Design an enzyme around this catalytic site. Structure first.
Site, PDB file in Angstrom:
ATOM      1  N   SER A  92      32.483 -37.224   1.794  1.00 54.65           N
ATOM      2  CA  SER A  92      33.917 -36.954   1.651  1.00 54.65           C
ATOM      3  C   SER A  92      34.756 -38.057   0.998  1.00 54.65           C
ATOM      4  CB  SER A  92      34.567 -36.658   3.008  1.00 54.65           C
ATOM      5  OG  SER A  92      34.108 -35.425   3.572  1.00 54.65           O
ATOM      6  N   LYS A 148      39.842 -43.501   3.322  1.00 59.14           N
ATOM      7  CA  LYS A 148      39.247 -42.173   3.257  1.00 59.14           C
ATOM      8  C   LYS A 148      37.820 -42.299   3.785  1.00 59.14           C
ATOM      9  CE  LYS A 148      38.617 -37.893   2.813  1.00 59.14           C
ATOM     10  NZ  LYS A 148      37.820 -37.951   4.087  1.00 59.14           N
ATOM     11  N   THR A 149      37.547 -41.622   4.892  1.00 62.98           N
ATOM     12  CA  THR A 149      36.224 -41.653   5.498  1.00 62.98           C
ATOM     13  C   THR A 149      35.308 -40.605   4.877  1.00 62.98           C
ATOM     14  OG1 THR A 149      37.125 -40.214   7.224  1.00 62.98           O
ATOM     15  CG2 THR A 149      36.909 -42.558   7.745  1.00 62.98           C
ATOM     16  N   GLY A 150      34.034 -40.687   5.234  1.00 59.45           N
ATOM     17  CA  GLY A 150      33.048 -39.739   4.761  1.00 59.45           C
ATOM     18  C   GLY A 150      31.944 -39.643   5.796  1.00 59.45           C
TER      19      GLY A 150
HETATM   20  C1  LIG Z   1      32.882 -35.380   4.139  1.00 54.47           C
HETATM   21  O1  LIG Z   1      32.061 -36.282   4.170  1.00 54.47           O
HETATM   22  C2  LIG Z   1      32.759 -34.133   5.033  1.00 54.47           C
HETATM   23  N1  LIG Z   1      31.543 -34.080   5.875  1.00 54.47           N
HETATM   24  C3  LIG Z   1      30.972 -32.879   6.121  1.00 54.47           C
HETATM   25  O2  LIG Z   1      31.551 -31.818   5.788  1.00 54.47           O
HETATM   26  C4  LIG Z   1      29.668 -32.965   6.776  1.00 54.47           C
HETATM   27  N2  LIG Z   1      29.394 -33.645   7.933  1.00 54.47           N
HETATM   28  O3  LIG Z   1      30.546 -34.298   8.525  1.00 54.47           O
HETATM   29  C5  LIG Z   1      30.239 -34.433   9.899  1.00 54.47           C
HETATM   30  C6  LIG Z   1      28.460 -32.301   6.209  1.00 54.47           C
HETATM   31  C7  LIG Z   1      28.463 -31.320   5.129  1.00 54.47           C
HETATM   32  S1  LIG Z   1      26.924 -30.822   4.702  1.00 54.47           S
HETATM   33  C8  LIG Z   1      26.238 -31.776   5.897  1.00 54.47           C
HETATM   34  N3  LIG Z   1      24.854 -31.851   6.151  1.00 54.47           N
HETATM   35  N4  LIG Z   1      27.162 -32.460   6.570  1.00 54.47           N
HETATM   36  C9  LIG Z   1      34.073 -34.143   6.008  1.00 54.47           C
HETATM   37  N5  LIG Z   1      34.439 -35.513   6.328  1.00 54.47           N
HETATM   38  C10 LIG Z   1      34.813 -36.035   7.500  1.00 54.47           C
HETATM   39  C11 LIG Z   1      34.948 -37.601   7.490  1.00 54.47           C
HETATM   40  O4  LIG Z   1      34.121 -38.309   8.097  1.00 54.47           O
HETATM   41  O5  LIG Z   1      35.921 -38.061   6.851  1.00 54.47           O
HETATM   42  C12 LIG Z   1      35.102 -35.130   8.669  1.00 54.47           C
HETATM   43  C13 LIG Z   1      35.504 -35.692   9.826  1.00 54.47           C
HETATM   44  C14 LIG Z   1      34.982 -33.700   8.579  1.00 54.47           C
HETATM   45  S2  LIG Z   1      34.024 -32.878   7.293  1.00 54.47           S
END
Ligand SMILES: *C(=O)[C@@H](NC(=O)/C(=N\OC)c1csc(N)n1)[C@@H]1N=C(C(=O)O)C(=C)CS1
Length: 260
Positions: free
Chosen positions: A42, A206-208
């Site tokens: 993300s 911005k986290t991911g």
């Molecule tokens: C961005 O990184 C996005 N992450 C996801 O949608 C996923 N896991 O997050 C727990 C994902 C998609 S496919 C897969 N195997 N996993 C979003 N980013 C965050 C963040 O950490 O900023 C969220 C809290 C929600 S979803």
């Protein structure tokens, strides 16, 4: 030393740590695996949002343009978009939701408007970022498979670009300020970089999060009596179902900001 501290942190973490800090006071840097590719997950939303802000520079009606939110647009995580099904959200609101709540549907709407992931990559390139690459939409862009080049960048590359976007030449002033406002208002990073810094410091980030326990955070930090610091902390692990380790990011942040 800082380098030995980061190495020690990584060794016990059970993962791969990527760090890139830029001290804008003298442009000095603290790097750890800063030239290695990591799945952005993300954190890539910053580039998609910035791409739209760049367009808004030549289209004064863009940010307020309404976008219809349909039930079919909802994916795996969309706390903001879900509240607007059967209604509309402006591009600016989508930018806000994507960055401050990491709403995946909001990210997809931004990509769709821009014309696809490749268009986000083209924008990164126009900023001089020759490393960044967006290949998929949400949520698949977060698979973070080891060795997979899709949707990756390097800590240094992202650090340089985030600096350019928030404190540099990338965007026109009003747009730059808008991006900064969005980053500062993020609600998803308390336990990440922010957790490893003095509580009085102002931060935009911005986290991911993704598979392989991928835990990321990119931020711009405003100390109370010093020039800003730009920090990228990326972390990923060998097993697909590993838990996220935001505590490692907070730890890395504490290590590299010691003294500022
Ligand atoms: C961005 O990184 C996005 N992450 C996801 O949608 C996923 N896991 O997050 C727990 C994902 C998609 S496919 C897969 N195997 N996993 C979003 N980013 C965050 C963040 O950490 O900023 C969220 C809290 C929600 S979803």
């Amino acid at each position: 030393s800082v380098q030995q501290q980061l190495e020690a942190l990584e060794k016990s973490s059970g993962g791969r740590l990527g760090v890139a800090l830029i001290n804008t006071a003298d442009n000095s840097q603290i790097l750890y695996r800063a030239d290695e590719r990591f799945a952005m997950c993300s954190t890539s939303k910053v580039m998609a949002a910035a791409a739209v802000l760049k367009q808004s520079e030549s289209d004064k009606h863009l940010l307020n343009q309404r976008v219809e939110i349909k039930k079919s647009d909802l994916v795996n995580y969309n706390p903001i978009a879900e509240k607007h099904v059967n209604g509309t959200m402006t591009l600016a609101e989508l930018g806000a939701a994507a960055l401050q709540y990491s709403d995946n549907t909001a990210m997809n709407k931004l990509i769709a408007h821009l014309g696809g992931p490749d268009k986000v990559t083209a924008f990164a390139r126009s900023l001089g970022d020759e490393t960044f690459r967006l290949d998929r939409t949400a949520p698949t862009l977060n698979t973070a498979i080891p060795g997979d080049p899709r949707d990756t960048t390097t800590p240094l590359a992202m650090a340089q670009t985030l600096k350019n976007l928030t404190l540099g030449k990338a965007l026109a002033e009003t747009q730059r300020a808008q991006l900064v406002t969005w980053l500062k208002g993020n609600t998803t990073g308390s336990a990440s970089i922010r957790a490893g810094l003095p509580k009085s410091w102002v931060v935009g980030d911005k986290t991911g999060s993704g598979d392989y326990g991928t835990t990321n955070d990119i931020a711009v930090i405003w100390p109370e009596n010093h020039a800003p610091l730009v920090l990228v902390t990326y972390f990923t692990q060998p097993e697909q179902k590993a838990e996220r380790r935001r505590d490692i990011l907070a730890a890395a942040a504490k290590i590299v900001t010691h003294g500022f």
